[PDB]
Amino acid sequence: SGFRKMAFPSGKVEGCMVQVTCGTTTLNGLWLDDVVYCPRHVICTSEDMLNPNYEDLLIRKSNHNFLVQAGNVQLRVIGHSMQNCVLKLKVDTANPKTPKYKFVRIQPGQTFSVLACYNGSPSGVYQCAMRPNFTIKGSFLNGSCGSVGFNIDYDCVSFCYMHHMELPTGVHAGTDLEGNFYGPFVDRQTAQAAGTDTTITVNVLAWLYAAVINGDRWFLNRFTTTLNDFNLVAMKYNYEPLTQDHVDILGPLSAQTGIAVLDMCASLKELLQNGMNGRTILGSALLEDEFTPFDVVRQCSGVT
Amino acid sequence: SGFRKMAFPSGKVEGCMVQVTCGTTTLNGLWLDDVVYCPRHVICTSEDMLNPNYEDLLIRKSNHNFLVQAGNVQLRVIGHSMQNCVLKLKVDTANPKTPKYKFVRIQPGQTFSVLACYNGSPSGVYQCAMRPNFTIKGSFLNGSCGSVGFNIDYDCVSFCYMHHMELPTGVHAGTDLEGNFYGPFVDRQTAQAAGTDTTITVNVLAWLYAAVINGDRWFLNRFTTTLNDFNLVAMKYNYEPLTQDHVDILGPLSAQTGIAVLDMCASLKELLQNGMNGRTILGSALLEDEFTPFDVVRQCSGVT
Ligand SMILES: Cc1ccncc1NC(=O)[C@H](C)c1cccc(Cl)c1
Ligand SMILES: Cc1ccncc1NC(=O)[C@H](C)c1cccc(Cl)c1
């Protein structure tokens, strides 16, 4: 029992972190096989970031200008290429610690663990959600660029995120491992607005099931609702509309607890309309949306 | 910017997790150098747990009855001893992945990362606090026994906790790495009460400083208080009394923000007396107490 914002064990990812220096800029890189991946803005000075022409900036750089250091040893760079917003540095040595891995582009509302790094060194791990507006509310300081988000399925690490930028609002933006930004963001020191964010409804419902499983049941009521009625409430409270696909993924939790998805929707409806009245659910005084139905099933069953 | 419940990178600890089986019971062990540490209740059957005589139960066991498996390979047990509530299995091979380490007994209110494990396999990492009543509000299922809590200072892992038991209330109890329980708990299937828990005042204050650093300042007021006046409020709201030692550890945060500790106490006093009025601080609708002043300084500066 107990329910925690749990992150994946970060070991397999720690073995991949390297420090990349180009000119006077240092950030983190991901060394997988014989390739080091990092944000392309490693090649810019602070003055370049205002309006960078990355093609022109990269043309002034050679293999020998990219300094890659893994722990305490130096990697020899034999090729460099830009793919979207990421640089790929071909090295002459394959990382002996390369885990089984994939590069995946996650959907908004999905969760992942972040290994926050500085100078190629891991400092912390936390679990977070890709917001519906494609931002992440991380914890990143200058030098954290190149830190990655990932999920793990038994022995396979699926890298889904690379940190690039902190927006003027303090929220974070980044790319998939092919360098494509999540959201409408560009890697430039220009004010950029993130869309209106919404609460991930299916995740809140999954979290309400985790609460019932762990004994927090005060919010269960004698009511039920319809998808249409629930969506009227969701719209008013800036919750993502619930679809039959979301109901389907909640099936295993509905099966375990015996509480039909639409009965849980009616509990959620009442909490949205009445608040928590000073009570807590799983030690939280607000509706938590950073646990997917898959995360609740995994945590509540002990998937290693 | 951003503030997360961040755990230490778990890599160095993952390399130490093993599976220990004795009879029909399997749990997790910690392999450091040529010794495997695990909860002594690995030797009990479900029937033994009601009122176990561990000395008598261990006398029926030999080195060959303890099966230790690290990943996929078997460790040869050449010695066994009980130290308080932990068994120490001497193995013929030193763990090649043994990090620099220490065994430390943490104080209540201190924080640590937990690597939750099942069958010697890591499944998740989360950060938590040792409650003032010596319990931890973890996330543990059957088979999680032997999972450990730790802190990391550059390259040194300080192990502070080993999970043993889930109390009838759903909270967790365990030992230091010498097998001494934190709190008044015994390793027996008998109802055991944890003391009245209190909120870790110094941690809430540290977290209010993290909020000011990250831009959440609405709770700052035009008031100040005295240690005596603040402690009257703390007593009424079941907060630990603040001492000059706590004020002293908050000095670096007071120095950074320019908000005197007693001015922050007056903000905390007003939040205790008025609640949050439907507002949030660092994405939380309640006063967070799982970040020490050291954790806030480390996270807010980027200590790797
Ligand atoms: C300062 C900081 C804090 C947290 N995350 C990232 C950062 N770093 C940045 O945002 C850096 C300086 C940057 C500027 C403009 C565009 C891009 Cl792609 C990257
Ligand atoms: C079931 C479970 C869930 C979460 N944590 C630990 C556990 N496991 C236990 O509490 C085990 C069965 C146990 C019983 C009585 C005393 C002791 Cl020392 C250990």
XYZ file of C-alpha atoms and ligand atoms in Angstrom:
646
model
C 0.000 0.000 0.000
C 0.909 3.688 -0.338
C 1.043 5.704 -3.539
C 4.059 7.717 -4.624
C 5.075 9.881 -7.606
C 7.557 7.188 -8.625
C 10.203 7.507 -11.284
C 11.919 4.704 -13.188
C 15.274 3.524 -11.766
C 17.716 5.841 -13.597
C 20.753 3.532 -13.755
C 20.608 2.587 -17.437
C 20.330 6.300 -18.361
C 23.109 7.444 -15.957
C 25.525 5.216 -17.904
C 24.685 7.227 -21.059
C 25.222 10.786 -19.765
C 28.185 12.731 -21.121
C 29.334 16.372 -21.098
C 29.440 18.193 -24.451
C 31.418 21.441 -24.840
C 31.530 23.558 -27.969
C 33.359 26.836 -27.732
C 32.485 28.183 -24.295
C 29.085 26.405 -23.966
C 28.787 23.165 -21.996
C 25.677 21.011 -21.756
C 24.645 17.335 -21.399
C 24.734 14.689 -24.096
C 23.293 11.194 -24.450
C 25.832 8.586 -25.590
C 24.119 5.573 -27.174
C 26.167 3.138 -29.276
C 28.738 5.337 -31.184
C 26.585 8.507 -31.282
C 26.293 11.383 -28.790
C 22.995 13.349 -28.925
C 22.665 16.876 -27.527
C 20.706 20.127 -28.090
C 22.071 21.953 -31.139
C 22.252 25.219 -29.168
C 25.547 23.923 -27.645
C 27.152 25.662 -30.725
C 25.736 29.115 -29.941
C 27.147 31.845 -27.780
C 24.664 33.836 -25.565
C 24.578 36.489 -28.370
C 23.743 33.840 -31.027
C 20.639 32.648 -29.112
C 18.703 35.862 -29.840
C 18.195 34.878 -33.523
C 20.480 31.926 -34.459
C 21.139 30.656 -37.946
C 22.070 27.100 -36.886
C 23.146 26.005 -40.396
C 25.602 28.912 -40.604
C 26.750 28.437 -37.009
C 27.411 24.705 -37.491
C 29.396 25.351 -40.732
C 32.025 27.174 -38.625
C 32.448 24.009 -36.444
C 34.565 20.926 -37.049
C 34.633 17.490 -35.305
C 37.576 18.673 -33.141
C 35.565 21.685 -31.786
C 33.071 19.319 -30.018
C 34.591 18.144 -26.760
C 32.800 15.061 -25.411
C 33.804 13.813 -21.964
C 32.224 10.677 -20.413
C 32.928 10.764 -16.692
C 36.659 11.438 -16.850
C 37.615 10.118 -20.337
C 37.571 11.956 -23.641
C 35.638 10.674 -26.697
C 37.069 11.179 -30.167
C 34.542 12.876 -32.525
C 34.684 11.522 -36.095
C 31.463 13.004 -37.535
C 28.822 15.639 -36.777
C 25.356 16.238 -38.124
C 22.332 18.268 -37.230
C 18.932 16.571 -37.207
C 16.164 19.123 -36.541
C 17.200 20.718 -33.111
C 19.666 17.993 -32.049
C 23.300 17.495 -32.952
C 24.487 13.918 -33.463
C 28.204 13.493 -32.799
C 29.605 10.288 -34.231
C 32.288 8.983 -31.850
C 34.952 6.283 -32.516
C 33.864 4.218 -29.443
C 30.488 2.602 -28.765
C 29.238 3.200 -25.215
C 29.863 -0.048 -23.317
C 26.954 0.881 -21.012
C 24.415 1.344 -23.864
C 21.175 -0.241 -22.681
C 18.523 -1.703 -25.043
C 16.773 1.420 -26.277
C 14.297 3.084 -28.599
C 13.495 6.681 -29.475
C 9.778 7.390 -29.116
C 7.644 10.496 -29.483
C 5.208 10.485 -26.583
C 1.689 11.888 -26.685
C 0.615 14.775 -24.444
C -0.771 13.476 -21.135
C 1.773 10.622 -21.093
C 4.288 10.389 -18.248
C 8.074 9.873 -18.062
C 11.059 10.088 -15.701
C 13.636 12.851 -16.072
C 17.266 12.435 -15.120
C 18.336 16.038 -14.429
C 22.061 16.489 -15.251
C 24.780 19.221 -15.046
C 28.221 18.939 -16.811
C 27.313 15.370 -17.814
C 26.634 14.423 -14.174
C 23.290 13.131 -12.890
C 21.964 15.061 -9.908
C 18.328 13.966 -9.566
C 15.437 11.928 -10.910
C 11.757 12.848 -10.890
C 8.552 11.736 -12.593
C 6.515 14.178 -14.663
C 3.816 14.444 -17.368
C 4.005 15.986 -20.825
C 1.344 18.716 -20.410
C -1.516 18.815 -22.993
C 0.136 22.132 -24.162
C 3.427 20.218 -24.784
C 5.377 21.829 -21.916
C 6.810 20.057 -18.863
C 6.825 21.574 -15.361
C 10.297 20.327 -14.562
C 13.078 21.451 -12.272
C 15.919 22.651 -14.494
C 18.701 25.211 -14.114
C 21.237 26.601 -16.653
C 23.473 23.691 -17.741
C 20.594 21.171 -17.481
C 20.104 21.269 -21.319
C 20.619 17.804 -22.769
C 19.012 16.065 -19.732
C 16.564 13.406 -20.916
C 13.108 11.988 -20.233
C 12.475 8.274 -20.589
C 10.321 5.217 -19.781
C 11.587 1.636 -19.160
C 9.873 -1.665 -20.216
C 11.827 -4.456 -18.388
C 15.272 -3.950 -20.017
C 14.414 -1.420 -22.790
C 14.801 2.334 -22.291
C 12.453 4.379 -24.462
C 13.865 7.888 -24.650
C 11.122 10.379 -25.250
C 12.482 13.791 -24.256
C 15.530 16.022 -24.325
C 15.511 19.286 -22.403
C 16.261 22.412 -24.426
C 14.634 25.528 -23.091
C 13.031 27.319 -20.156
C 10.170 29.565 -21.284
C 9.797 33.092 -19.735
C 7.007 31.607 -17.548
C 9.358 29.091 -15.854
C 7.941 26.032 -17.606
C 10.113 23.815 -19.814
C 10.292 22.837 -23.489
C 12.241 20.234 -25.357
C 12.397 17.773 -28.190
C 12.019 14.063 -28.952
C 15.418 12.313 -29.655
C 15.124 13.148 -33.402
C 15.251 16.884 -32.369
C 11.621 17.718 -33.132
C 10.161 20.053 -30.503
C 7.136 19.046 -28.542
C 4.748 21.934 -29.114
C 5.164 25.105 -31.169
C 8.517 26.038 -29.627
C 11.697 27.071 -31.433
C 15.233 27.049 -29.954
C 15.575 30.850 -29.828
C 15.750 33.450 -26.962
C 12.438 34.961 -27.958
C 9.203 35.140 -25.924
C 7.093 32.131 -26.877
C 3.735 31.313 -25.553
C 2.631 27.857 -24.513
C -1.036 27.103 -25.263
C -3.791 27.092 -22.619
C -3.018 24.038 -20.475
C -5.745 21.605 -19.437
C -5.952 18.957 -16.717
C -5.375 15.371 -17.999
C -8.818 13.936 -17.090
C -7.996 10.212 -17.678
C -4.965 10.558 -15.346
C -7.037 12.160 -12.558
C -9.562 9.284 -12.911
C -6.706 6.729 -12.814
C -5.411 8.464 -9.644
C -8.903 8.327 -8.052
C -8.825 4.536 -8.688
C -5.343 4.411 -6.991
C -6.925 6.260 -4.025
C -9.811 3.721 -3.767
C -7.270 0.849 -3.981
C -5.231 2.380 -1.136
C -8.210 3.137 1.153
C -9.031 6.794 0.424
C -12.730 6.394 -0.470
C -14.487 9.446 1.104
C -15.013 10.976 -2.366
C -17.066 8.002 -3.647
C -20.703 8.949 -3.932
C -24.151 7.501 -4.775
C -24.153 9.205 -8.213
C -23.392 8.317 -11.786
C -23.129 10.421 -14.966
C -22.900 10.108 -18.798
C -19.828 10.938 -21.008
C -21.822 13.913 -22.374
C -22.791 15.269 -18.911
C -19.258 14.696 -17.559
C -17.727 16.506 -20.565
C -19.933 19.570 -19.881
C -18.328 19.734 -16.365
C -14.822 18.976 -17.770
C -15.198 21.890 -20.269
C -16.225 24.313 -17.501
C -13.193 23.274 -15.347
C -10.575 23.108 -18.180
C -10.271 19.332 -18.064
C -9.539 17.399 -21.276
C -12.761 15.839 -22.697
C -13.041 12.167 -21.782
C -13.393 9.809 -24.785
C -14.356 6.099 -25.073
C -10.586 5.423 -25.674
C -9.887 6.852 -22.146
C -12.784 4.783 -20.642
C -11.203 1.687 -22.329
C -7.776 2.271 -20.781
C -9.429 2.678 -17.351
C -11.072 -0.788 -17.770
C -8.478 -2.693 -15.687
C -8.933 -0.265 -12.728
C -12.689 -0.389 -13.080
C -12.359 -4.247 -13.122
C -10.145 -4.351 -9.985
C -12.272 -1.958 -7.872
C -15.716 -2.821 -9.212
C -16.438 0.924 -9.679
C -17.730 1.578 -13.215
C -15.782 4.344 -15.074
C -18.886 6.595 -15.276
C -19.488 6.194 -11.506
C -15.872 7.382 -10.976
C -16.627 10.277 -13.417
C -19.567 11.269 -11.130
C -17.216 11.333 -8.111
C -14.806 13.534 -10.161
C -17.749 15.735 -11.229
C -18.715 16.311 -7.560
C -15.073 17.057 -6.547
C -14.859 19.592 -9.413
C -18.126 21.264 -8.417
C -17.490 21.152 -4.590
C -13.725 21.069 -4.104
C -12.175 18.852 -1.401
C -13.734 20.668 1.649
C -10.316 20.699 3.341
C -9.765 16.955 2.899
C -6.906 15.136 1.144
C -6.705 12.285 -1.375
C -3.448 10.256 -1.388
C -1.828 13.076 0.657
C -2.779 15.716 -1.922
C -5.209 18.635 -1.487
C -5.696 18.912 -5.269
C -6.630 16.573 -8.116
C -3.440 14.862 -9.309
C -2.996 14.356 -13.086
C 0.611 12.987 -13.403
C -0.256 9.274 -13.135
C -1.571 7.487 -16.225
C -3.849 4.387 -15.946
C -0.755 2.311 -16.946
C 1.307 3.914 -14.145
C -1.380 3.122 -11.565
C -1.624 -0.535 -12.751
C 2.208 -0.906 -12.718
C 2.676 0.702 -9.279
C -0.310 -1.031 -7.687
C 0.849 -4.490 -8.953
C 4.656 -4.207 -8.571
C 5.913 -4.321 -12.174
C 9.743 -4.332 -12.158
C 13.444 27.205 -12.185
C 10.750 24.722 -11.124
C 10.701 22.649 -7.958
C 10.271 18.889 -7.920
C 10.196 16.089 -5.319
C 13.532 14.852 -6.657
C 15.215 11.608 -5.752
C 18.905 10.758 -6.038
C 19.963 8.956 -9.249
C 19.519 5.289 -8.227
C 22.234 3.712 -10.399
C 24.830 3.002 -7.710
C 22.131 1.300 -5.580
C 20.625 -0.704 -8.500
C 24.022 -2.403 -8.908
C 23.726 -3.647 -5.292
C 20.237 -5.212 -5.390
C 19.987 -8.989 -5.134
C 17.208 -11.530 -4.497
C 17.392 -13.546 -1.260
C 15.341 -16.745 -0.842
C 15.166 -18.820 2.312
C 12.743 -21.696 2.316
C 9.696 -20.395 0.467
C 10.218 -16.672 1.304
C 11.865 -14.344 -1.213
C 12.814 -10.729 -0.576
C 15.458 -8.142 -1.587
C 19.034 -7.972 -0.375
C 21.788 -5.364 -0.553
C 25.127 -6.728 -1.794
C 28.030 -4.519 -0.693
C 31.591 -5.873 -0.863
C 31.313 -9.621 0.117
C 28.215 -9.244 2.342
C 24.503 -9.414 1.473
C 22.159 -7.568 3.893
C 18.442 -8.361 4.134
C 15.554 -8.338 6.661
C 15.875 -11.303 9.027
C 12.209 -12.214 8.468
C 13.299 -13.881 5.168
C 13.766 -17.019 7.409
C 10.163 -17.081 8.659
C 7.136 -18.720 7.152
C 3.788 -16.771 7.299
C 2.958 -18.806 10.476
C 6.299 -17.850 12.117
C 5.609 -14.094 11.739
C 2.840 -14.129 14.374
C 5.384 -14.520 17.232
C 8.847 -15.452 15.839
C 11.804 -16.626 17.861
C 14.457 -15.491 15.349
C 17.377 -17.096 17.240
C 15.632 -20.483 17.160
C 14.500 -20.019 13.558
C 18.007 -19.102 12.352
C 19.553 -22.135 14.162
C 17.595 -24.411 11.783
C 19.243 -22.645 8.764
C 22.612 -23.269 7.146
C 24.620 -21.236 4.561
C 23.241 -23.476 1.763
C 19.581 -22.655 2.706
C 20.086 -18.946 1.743
C 19.793 -18.599 -2.011
C 21.270 -15.304 -3.233
C 20.822 -14.432 -6.905
C 22.292 -11.221 -8.412
C 20.523 -10.589 -11.701
C 20.914 -14.048 -13.214
C 23.981 -15.447 -11.357
C 24.090 -17.328 -8.079
C 26.235 -16.189 -5.109
C 27.884 -18.776 -2.887
C 27.056 -18.206 0.830
C 30.004 -18.939 3.149
C 28.733 -17.387 6.408
C 25.539 -16.080 8.014
C 24.902 -13.906 11.024
C 22.054 -11.969 12.509
C 22.662 -8.385 13.617
C 19.553 -6.967 15.333
C 16.751 -7.368 12.617
C 19.070 -7.876 9.617
C 20.787 -10.993 8.352
C 24.302 -10.594 6.958
C 25.194 -13.283 4.426
C 28.912 -13.536 3.785
C 29.437 -14.399 0.104
C 32.644 -15.666 -1.609
C 32.576 -12.819 -4.213
C 32.794 -9.070 -3.611
C 30.228 -7.089 -5.615
C 32.133 -5.551 -8.539
C 29.525 -2.752 -8.609
C 29.970 -1.801 -4.908
C 29.942 1.992 -4.767
C 31.721 4.045 -2.051
C 29.325 3.723 0.862
C 28.519 4.276 4.515
C 25.769 3.078 6.829
C 24.129 5.989 8.641
C 21.223 6.289 11.050
C 19.212 9.304 9.951
C 17.269 11.591 12.266
C 13.490 11.983 11.992
C 12.595 14.823 9.607
C 15.549 13.963 7.338
C 14.909 12.928 3.732
C 16.133 10.060 1.517
C 15.472 8.275 -1.786
C 13.957 4.794 -1.845
C 14.677 2.271 -4.560
C 11.578 0.039 -4.429
C 12.485 -3.541 -5.484
C 10.741 -6.933 -6.084
C 12.664 -10.275 -6.491
C 15.929 -8.298 -6.444
C 14.740 -6.089 -9.327
C 14.392 -2.303 -9.115
C 10.981 -1.032 -10.178
C 10.872 2.593 -9.002
C 12.567 5.439 -7.174
C 10.928 8.113 -5.039
C 11.956 10.695 -2.454
C 10.479 10.628 1.040
C 10.977 11.849 4.637
C 11.465 9.850 7.820
C 8.358 11.018 9.741
C 8.897 12.486 13.265
C 7.103 9.265 14.491
C 9.780 7.147 12.695
C 7.460 5.786 9.977
C 7.746 6.396 6.227
C 4.734 6.905 3.940
C 6.187 4.824 1.146
C 4.755 2.788 -1.692
C 5.531 -0.855 -0.934
C 3.858 -4.164 -1.764
C 4.562 -7.743 -0.537
C 8.055 -8.704 -1.771
C 9.353 -5.116 -1.390
C 11.075 -6.047 1.949
C 14.810 -5.453 1.677
C 14.365 -2.328 -0.529
C 16.601 0.475 0.741
C 16.633 4.205 1.445
C 19.760 6.235 0.791
C 21.400 9.639 0.191
C 24.372 10.357 -2.147
C 27.251 12.870 -1.563
C 29.121 13.078 -4.941
C 30.321 9.434 -5.193
C 29.396 8.108 -1.698
C 26.108 6.314 -1.021
C 24.938 6.646 2.575
C 22.438 3.873 3.204
C 20.018 4.870 5.895
C 16.995 2.582 5.576
C 15.883 -0.958 4.860
C 12.196 -1.718 4.439
C 10.776 -4.391 6.734
C 7.130 -3.944 7.535
C 3.794 -2.398 6.601
C 1.815 -1.375 9.689
C -1.987 -2.081 9.832
C -2.496 1.633 8.983
C -0.695 1.344 5.607
C 2.400 3.269 6.678
C 5.861 1.680 6.604
C 8.556 0.717 9.114
C 12.117 -0.403 8.750
C 15.621 -0.415 10.100
C 19.008 1.262 9.644
C 21.614 -1.045 7.914
C 22.722 -2.431 11.331
C 19.120 -3.819 11.705
C 17.957 -1.414 14.411
C 14.354 -0.328 13.833
C 13.505 3.296 13.441
C 10.824 3.833 16.067
C 9.304 1.408 18.569
C 8.540 -1.275 15.978
C 9.327 -4.988 16.177
C 9.433 -7.426 13.222
C 6.281 -9.329 14.235
C 2.722 -9.642 12.741
C 1.185 -7.877 15.701
C -0.739 -4.570 15.757
C 1.752 -1.819 16.555
C 0.986 1.785 16.902
C 3.090 4.566 15.458
C 3.235 7.700 17.635
C 1.276 10.895 16.900
C 2.932 12.309 13.772
C 3.803 15.994 13.486
C 4.603 18.243 10.525
C 8.368 18.894 10.048
C 8.305 22.699 10.560
C 11.896 23.441 9.360
C 11.151 21.550 6.102
C 7.937 23.520 5.456
C 9.920 26.762 6.028
C 12.670 25.529 3.660
C 9.942 24.763 1.070
C 8.443 28.272 1.500
C 11.940 29.648 0.688
C 12.011 27.371 -2.448
C 8.616 28.886 -3.398
C 9.928 32.488 -3.018
C 13.025 31.551 -5.088
C 10.803 30.144 -7.859
C 8.330 33.070 -7.939
C 5.453 31.911 -5.712
C 5.367 34.868 -3.285
C 1.625 35.532 -2.631
C 1.961 34.130 0.916
C 4.600 36.708 1.959
C 3.102 39.231 4.325
C 3.923 42.454 6.232
C 4.221 40.549 9.550
C 6.926 39.096 11.719
C 6.823 36.883 14.834
C 9.054 35.535 17.670
C 10.186 31.865 18.176
C 7.922 31.766 21.268
C 4.833 33.152 19.449
C 5.462 30.914 16.411
C 5.814 27.831 18.653
C 2.400 28.563 20.246
C 0.882 28.341 16.696
C 3.037 25.274 15.807
C 1.769 23.471 18.971
C -1.876 24.205 18.097
C -1.377 22.858 14.512
C 0.791 19.790 15.406
C 3.953 21.225 13.885
C 7.341 20.373 15.428
C 8.598 23.262 17.645
C 11.137 25.407 15.815
C 14.523 25.716 17.590
C 17.534 28.041 17.047
C 19.281 24.990 15.413
C 16.489 24.976 12.733
C 16.784 28.802 12.284
C 20.580 28.266 11.792
C 20.120 25.677 9.042
C 17.679 28.036 7.271
C 20.394 30.778 7.255
C 21.548 30.151 3.654
C 17.937 30.469 2.342
C 17.338 33.536 4.459
C 20.653 34.931 3.024
C 19.689 34.190 -0.620
C 16.140 35.633 -0.434
C 16.723 38.429 2.066
C 13.665 37.237 4.064
C 14.585 36.835 7.751
C 13.665 33.375 9.194
C 11.161 34.911 11.667
C 9.470 36.863 8.826
C 9.061 33.508 6.997
C 7.691 32.049 10.299
C 5.032 34.839 10.281
C 4.020 33.871 6.719
C 3.774 30.208 7.892
C 1.783 31.340 10.960
C -0.757 33.133 8.711
C -1.033 30.113 6.335
C -1.664 27.859 9.369
C -4.321 30.190 10.773
C -5.992 31.001 7.366
C -5.284 28.062 5.068
C -4.424 28.651 1.389
C -7.829 30.188 0.349
C -7.900 27.896 -2.699
C -4.429 28.923 -3.887
C -1.365 26.740 -4.531
C 2.319 26.966 -3.586
C 4.779 25.133 -5.889
C 1.785 23.242 -7.377
C 0.650 22.010 -3.953
C -2.570 22.909 -2.100
C -1.024 21.916 1.254
C 2.131 22.755 3.201
C 4.902 20.439 1.979
C 7.315 19.014 4.598
C 9.460 16.497 2.585
C 12.218 18.931 1.551
C 14.946 19.765 4.068
C 16.858 23.112 3.938
C 19.812 21.101 2.487
C 17.559 19.628 -0.236
C 16.300 23.085 -1.218
C 19.885 24.485 -1.385
C 21.075 21.463 -3.453
C 18.125 21.532 -5.886
C 18.074 25.316 -6.248
C 21.863 25.433 -6.986
C 22.327 22.264 -9.099
C 24.518 20.049 -6.893
C 25.416 16.866 -8.824
C 18.467 28.830 -18.050
C 17.752 27.510 -18.177
C 17.001 27.008 -17.121
C 16.262 25.854 -17.299
N 16.217 25.172 -18.449
C 16.954 25.632 -19.465
C 17.740 26.780 -19.376
N 18.532 27.193 -20.460
C 18.062 27.807 -21.570
O 16.868 28.036 -21.760
C 19.130 28.224 -22.586
C 20.015 29.382 -22.117
C 18.418 28.513 -23.902
C 18.000 29.798 -24.230
C 17.207 30.018 -25.345
C 16.823 28.955 -26.152
C 17.294 27.691 -25.850
Cl 16.916 26.363 -26.909
C 18.084 27.458 -24.743
C 2.753 -6.880 2.715
C 3.750 -5.749 2.727
C 3.465 -4.548 2.091
C 4.343 -3.487 2.213
N 5.477 -3.540 2.922
C 5.773 -4.699 3.519
C 4.956 -5.826 3.443
N 5.339 -7.033 4.051
C 5.272 -7.284 5.378
O 4.896 -6.452 6.204
C 5.682 -8.700 5.795
C 4.689 -9.785 5.370
C 5.932 -8.677 7.298
C 4.927 -9.000 8.203
C 5.115 -8.812 9.563
C 6.315 -8.300 10.039
C 7.328 -8.039 9.136
Cl 8.876 -7.502 9.721
C 7.155 -8.222 7.780
